[PDB]
Amino acid sequence: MTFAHEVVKSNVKNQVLFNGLTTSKLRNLMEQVNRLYTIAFNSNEDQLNEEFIDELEYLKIKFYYEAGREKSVDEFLKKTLMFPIIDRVIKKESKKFFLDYCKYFEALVAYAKYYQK
Amino acid sequence: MTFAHEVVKSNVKNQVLFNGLTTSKLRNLMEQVNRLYTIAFNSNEDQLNEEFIDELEYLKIKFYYEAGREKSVDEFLKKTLMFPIIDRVIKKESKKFFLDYCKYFEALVAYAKYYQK
Amino acid sequence: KNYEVVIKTLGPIHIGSGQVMKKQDYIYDFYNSKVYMINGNKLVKFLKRKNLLYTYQNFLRYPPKNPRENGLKDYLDAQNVKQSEWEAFVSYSEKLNDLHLMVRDGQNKVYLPGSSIKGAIKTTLVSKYNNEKNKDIYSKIKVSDSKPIDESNLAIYQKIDINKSEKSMPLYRECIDVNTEIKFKLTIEDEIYSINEIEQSIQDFYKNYYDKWLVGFKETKGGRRFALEGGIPDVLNQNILFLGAGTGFVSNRKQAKQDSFEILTKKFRGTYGKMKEIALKGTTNQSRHTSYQQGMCKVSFQ
Amino acid sequence: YSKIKISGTIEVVTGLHIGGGGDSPVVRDLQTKLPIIPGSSIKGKMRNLLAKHFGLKMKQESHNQDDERVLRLFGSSEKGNIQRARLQISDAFFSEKTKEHFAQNDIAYTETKFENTINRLTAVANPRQIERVTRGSEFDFVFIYNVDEESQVEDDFENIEKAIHLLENDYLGGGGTRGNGRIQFKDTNIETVVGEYDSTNLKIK
RNA sequence: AUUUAUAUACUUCGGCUACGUGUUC
RNA sequence: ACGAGAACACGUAUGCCGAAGUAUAUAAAU
């Protein structure tokens, strides 16, 4: 959807990335999404498991906590709108859309990785 | 179109290949294109599938990320202009032209393979 | 051929899995010195069956930023969860800003990877034979993974920077307890590097390690406390090796100094650049006032 | 003419990483999406090991021509000769008891151990994610023994049982020198599926 | 609590429609 | 009452044979 690419280009300010965000600040983040990526890729049906719903809730927990730690993490998590998309994934109970979100976050990660000091 | 052959000959500098590029640096690359090659060769109509559009987007993801990792990969991906041709393929939604791009990249791979230390 | 190898853990052993446990899933008990890992499924199912999930959410989701109110025990106590109930929701326990977890198997039991055990063996073999094609003589040496290790031999330990003046490091690592006996099977495809050959080689590495580096930390309270308690004069006859993390780099002084400067340039340039204009790893047990160094254990063949 | 069925189960004692398709995944089916042991790996391991256990000359080492009994048991048919493989080694499937065991114990179907690459005198680390079939997994396998000549069944099954034993004392798959790939054989049953050959006095450990 | 993120080698090698048979009574 | 009229390019046999997705490099430093 590459709107992530557009926002990342809009976030290279005069240089800094998201005003002090580094890819290693994202460690716990992509680790959680990849762990969920595995547990979901194992599943068969698109109808999500309900401990999987619990795991998505726990992921939102990690989001709110990372945002609490750092201001740059807060800015990143707010502008690029992780938060409504997680909410709608929780509301939808669809696996394929979960992987769509996964590729979304991975796109953010890769593009930022190439877009650095 | 063999302009790939011309650029590869222009890229044998005094010897090195693309200033430190090796065919095994291309592993993930040709693996992705071949995987897409299979999924597309299975299709019937030339009008591309839209998860196929998503897959092309994911391929562009792999492109920037590989470019981010290595400088030689960046030089290769920039000069030989993978990037506009992927953009126009995404814009065109045509299968036969997708296979045309596929044999393009395979031509690059083979010629480079014969064009080595 | 094939041999069974026993491992007796003299001190804390760490094999990093890359999981740094965060401000969650533990209860650090200041007054009893135990940290309680919490099962995710049972805890959240308790939150759901008592309708405390919603309150727990807003508690965690609003970080009070108050250091006394940024744990899990305070969150549980604010809901007045019984101590008996709380103790049941504890998956497993060990005697903490973060916590680095160990490697665990498919059933979350801990085992020694074949990589780390062989990796330390390779470090020893390279030194003894100055890398006498030791890269080639891998493919004909085979190490099997250890058998599982029950939880009862796991504990928390702080990393201490033991110099002439001791300093405490901020972070904690999980380790296998003292005197734990560990089994694994060895396979030999080349008779040239026989079993006695391996034992002598690693012993010689230990002796060179002593007369280069383990003599230097004397006059330190903990240092002489550890070295004498471990009996390192007799250990020169004993078969000892540092495994995985927690061991210094050294597992001439001028070349060592230059190499250390280069390594620290590559490592700490992002946090402490003081090296460019310029330290032993140990664990001190509050229970016993006994400091151990992380890594060493006895190895015996059969 | 007759055929003899060799059936059993393989359990997995340490990690298993066949990785034929390759962060670096393993070979997995696409009907049900569970890992499998390709029969090609079974046959390659068995052939190489049983061949090396008897004689192996450098001229023998040259071009995949080996002693007469392996060339009989597994088949070569290039050197202007008539010989077809007398064993039909199939693929291995992650059995149903394992399905239910891990499903009702909530244990994953595969671990993911992390690796590192400590460079000498540089101490810079290079990470690595790798995936492997968990311990205790069991697969079911079948071998079919065609009977071409009546008088060599006994000796061939003696060689087959030696192959099974030697495999039991060796690894299977990838990275076996770093401690993953140990297997063990149990629950072997021998039946005559087509014909009038007797399968009573015949045993495999 | 702070940097990596799979790395270089090989990406199918060997060995290349035969017979009744064409046409007439 | 057409150099016409009858007339299955038809019948027997495969993509097989042998080949392991391998072989190296400890989740580390303060």
Give the minimum alpha-carbon distance from D24 to chain C in angstroms, rounded to a whole number. 17
Q: Do A44 and D109 touch (CB under 8 A)?
A: no
Q: What is the resolution of this structure in A?
A: 3.7
Instruction: Give the CA diameter of chain C.
Output: 67
**C35 three-state secondary structure:** strand
d(CA C73, CA C81): 10
CA B10 and chain centroid, separation: 18
Q: Which structure tokens are listed for D111?
A: 């671990």
Residues of A in contact with B91 (CB under 8 A): none
Please list every residue in chain D whose beta carbon sits closer than 8 Å to the beta carbon of residue C18.
Answer: 114, 127
- How many angstroms away from the CA of A60 is the closest CA of chain B? 25
Q: Is D33 on the interface with A (CB under 8 A)?
A: yes
Say how far residue C148 (Cα) sits from the centre of its chain.
17
Reduce the DSSP state of residue C293 to 3 states and report it. Answer: strand
- C86 pairs with which residues across the strands? none
- Cα(C289)–Cα(C302) distance, rounded to whole angstroms? 36
Long-range interactions of C246-252: CB distance < 8 A, separation 24+: C246/C12, C246/C13, C246/C14, C246/C159, C246/C173, C246/C175, C246/C281, C246/C293, C246/C294, C246/C295, C247/C281, C247/C294, C247/C295, C248/C213, C248/C279, C248/C280, C248/C281, C249/D123, C250/C209, C250/C212, C250/C213, C251/C123, C251/C209, C251/C295
Q: Nearest nucleotide to B68 by CA–C1' distance?
A: E5
B72 strand E contact, CB < 7 Å? no
Torsion of CA D149, D154, D157, D162, to 10 degrees: -130
Contact D14 C145 (CB under 8 A): yes
D18 labelled ligand-binding? no
Q: Strand order in C167-176's β-sheet? A: C16-21, C99-102, C167-176, C154-162, C280-285, C290-293
Check the annotation: does D201 bind a ligand: no
- Touch of D by A (3+ CB pairs closer than 8 Å): yes
Nucleotides of F under 7 A from a protein CB: 17-30
Residue with tokens 């066949």: D18
Taking the C-alpha atoms of residue D44 and residue D18, their distance in angstroms, rounded to an integer, is: 12
Residue C104's φ and ψ, nearest 5 degrees, are -135, 155
The string of DSSP codes covering D85-145 is -SEEE--EEE-HHHHHHHHHHT--SEE--EE----TTT-----EE--EEPTT-EEEEEEEE
* Angular region, C169: left φ>0, alpha ψ -120 to 50, beta rest: beta
B67 near B73, Cβ under 8 Å? yes
Tokens of C205: 């590495």
Counted residue by residue, chain A has a size of 117
Within window 68-87 on D, which residues have Cβ closer than 7 Å to strand F? 74-78, 84-85
Nearest residue to C181 (alpha-carbon basis) of C15, C297, C288, C17: C297
Could you give the count of Cα atoms lying within 13 Å of B99 in the half-sphere of its Cβ? Answer: 10
Task: Tell me chain C's radius of gyration from C-alpha atoms.
Answer: 22
**Range A29-33, long-range pairs (CB < 8 A, 24+ positions):** A29/A62, A29/A63, A29/A66, A29/A105, A30/A105, A30/A106, A30/A109, A32/A59, A32/A62, A33/A59, A33/A102, A33/A105, A33/A106
Distance C120 CA to F26 C1' (A): 6
- Give the position of tokens 């940290």: C35
d(CA D85, CA D76): 8
CA–centroid distance for B11 within its chain: 16
Do residue B68 and residue A114 have CB atoms under 8 angstroms apart?
yes
Q: Which residue places its CA closest to the C1' of nucleotide F22? A: D174
Mutation to test the C interface, candidates A54, A70, A90, A117, most C Cβ within 10 Å: A54
CA pair distance A41, A99, nearest whole angstrom:
8
Residues B52/B43, Cβ–Cβ less than 8 Å? yes
As a whole number of angstroms, the distance between CA D74 and CA C289 comes to 66
Answer whether any strand F atom is within 7 A of the Cβ of D49.
Answer: no
Distance of CA C82 to the CA centre of its chain: 34
Mutate: best of C60, C62, C69, partner A, most A CBs <10 A: C60
Nucleotide nearest to D45 (CA to C1'): F20
**What distance in Å separates the CA atoms of residue C288 and residue C284, rounded to the nearest whole number?**
8
| Experimental method reported for this structure | cryo-EM
C-alpha C68: how far from its chain's center?
28
Contacts of B65 in chain A (CB under 8 A): 110-111, 113-114
How far is C278 from D168, CA to CA, in rounded Å? 56
Helix (H), strand (E) at residue C47:
helix C40-49
User: Strand E: which bases are under 7 Å from protein Cβ?
Assistant: 1-11, 14
Nucleotide F28 C1' to residue D114 CA (A): 14
Distance from CA of A20 to the nearest CA of B (A): 19
d(CA C144, CA C187): 8
Q: Is A14 near chain B, with CB under 8 Å? A: no
Q: How do beta strands C2-9 and C296-300 pair? A: antiparallel
- Give the integer Cα–Cα distance in Å for C225 and C282: 12
**For chain A, where are the E strands, in sequence order?**
12-13, 16-17
- Compute the nearest-CA separation of A10 from chain B (Å): 17
Count Cα neighbours of D73 within 13 Å in the Cβ-side half-sphere: 26
- Residue C257's contacts (CB-CB under 8 Å, 6 or more residues apart) are none
Helix (H) or strand (E) holding A91: helix A82-92
